[model samples]
Target: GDIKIKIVSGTASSFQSGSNIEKSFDGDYSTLYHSSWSNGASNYFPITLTYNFETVTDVDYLIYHPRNNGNNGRFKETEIQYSADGHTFTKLIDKDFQGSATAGKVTFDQTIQAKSFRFIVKSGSGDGQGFASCAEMEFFAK
Candidate 1:
């Protein structure tokens, strides 16, 4: 199917100005959602975020786009989870992402129909202690 998943709402652990969590679903690479960094200090690792669909949708894969301007807040390690109730979730994948300035696709072993999905980013590229960010996250229906 050519259906693309749509996120009705989302929340992030922390975000910087003009780069809020919803930016990840905007489909524009120039805009991105970045974790907070202030006073020469960065947000702690293991930041989390969740995206909700309008209804239960069959998803087979996801495309992750890192920040295009820089690699300061790219994901290093992340755990993807899906939930039907929007509360309890099942683990889908624990992925390790390279610090590359390109888009990457993650295909699921099987298609999952869920109402919401969560991303638990364990670390950021480079120092692992730095912030995490995503230019866009696109989901494809099976």
Candidate 2:
């Protein structure tokens, strides 16, 4: 179950260039994806982005990067869930993480098989009410 993962095209709730929702899986950490913040009322909080892989990848670790901006778009809480049919997802990684200018590498208790991965943002930089962005998100098999 140690097959390498192949990056493929994935879609998000909001597919925009300005927001850069697709940047999360672009494998480029130089620019992070900024969730659309409308009129300062709605930021990138509570947004969900989905990623797809070439095959049913077995993964246990979710390596994610929170936006390194000065107290702006870091994720406070997140849930790393996955699905086989992209409909029903079982929660795998649900926890609070310290927000900083560093990346997060969280590992699950066991490996999970998934065809698509979903990233659900429960809370972000502004303490559950702020913009959300990250350098990149990746998965590891073990």
Candidate 3:
């Protein structure tokens, strides 16, 4: 079943204002969370978007969806990392979005305990200075 949590923060070495992180888990396939291009430049890959939970918990899987707007900046290469203390993160899953896939989903055989996690986008479906757009980031727990 779906386990809901609030995304308390979306910050890191880089921060962009006006991002509605809630849309990532809002259960709407049409709504999305977008990042800034920063005056049409300076946006780069490997950008970190951290998600928070009320308390430490375990998750069964995490899903990624391409931007409903378009595939211009959809996730092509991504890494899923989990953290116990919100500071140190351990890589739990790493994947790349590929052929015939409009959406990406990763599941675990067993639960992965964590207090928080992040989506590290190495390369999305865009050129240099590309931004990431996610229609929804669904989380499930056991």
Candidate 4:
């Protein structure tokens, strides 16, 4: 059996003033979290977005929604990491996503009991801007 999981709180490496980590799971496609674009066209790979569950839960997968307005901040090379105490962590998946305006999915081989999880963007959108953004993210239990 599977159940939809809710993220209690989240944090991001960087975000524009109005666009923050909460926008990533706000259930609003029109809003998104935009990474910092400082330094006049610099690459900010390896950006991190972490989310914590209200309680320890068995997580199975995640659906990551790329920014809808533009292709600037979509994640390319990415990794999913999980932790039990929000300290030590382990990788659950290492994959890549095309620059699609649609949502992308990541699945674990089996259910992982975790208290927190994070998505690490190793590469930015195909546009080569070196920045990343997420409109929404949904996790599920196995």
The lDDT per prediction is 0.83, 0.69, 0.69, 0.82
Q: What is candidate 3's local distance difference test score?
A: 0.69
Which residue pairs of candidate 2 clash? none
Best by lDDT: 1
Cα error, residue 38 of model 2, in Å, equals 1.5
Q: List clashing residue pairs in candidate 1.
A: none
Tell me the TM-score of each prediction against the true structure.
0.90, 0.81, 0.79, 0.90
* Collision count for each candidate, in order: 0, 0, 0, 0
Pairs with steric clashes in candidate 3: none
For candidate 4, the lDDT comes to: 0.82
- Once fitted onto the true fold, the runs of candidate 2 whose alpha carbons sit more than 4 angstroms away are 1-4, 14-16, 39-44, 126-128
lDDT by residue (tens digit), candidate 4, 35-62: 8766145445678989888888988888
Judged by whole-model lDDT over C-alpha atoms, candidate 1 comes out at 0.83
User: Distance (Å) between predicted and true CA of 141, model 4?
Assistant: 1.5
TM-score of structure candidate 4: 0.90
- State candidate 2's TM-score: 0.81
Greater lDDT among 1 and 4 belongs to 1
